[PDB]
Design a binder for this molecule. Sequence first.
Ligand code: D7Q
Length: 113
Amino acid sequence: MGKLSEQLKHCNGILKELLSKKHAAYAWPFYKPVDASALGLHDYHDIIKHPMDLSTVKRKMENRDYRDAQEFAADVRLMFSNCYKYNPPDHDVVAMARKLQDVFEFRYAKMPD
Ligand SMILES: CC(=O)N1c2ccccc2N(Cc2ccccc2C(=O)O)C[C@@H]1C1CC1
């Protein structure tokens, strides 16, 4: 009934969409934590102090970690910012981040209030 719960439902709906087949062509790099060692990215954790990805956001939502929409949004945007920080701006993953963030921002803006 409460507004914070309603706003978190909206957040959970967004999260579901971001993880859906509809956006999978560009969302997939953000599905799981960056495995720096496996990708040979030995500077990743020197550059990115707070890694974030959609499975972590999903775990946090499932664990009732997010107390409000703003906290949820902060993690999703952190995930995109990390991508923009680490990768040169002309890399394919940055194009995919921008597209997925477009999905996120436009639906997030329809927050019930
Ligand atoms: C989330 C994130 O920033 N990353 C990411 C995360 C998980 C999986 C892949 C990636 N990609 C790689 C990648 C994406 C898309 C298309 C091709 C490639 C390619 O291999 O050239 C890059 C980057 C890595 C930080 C460099």
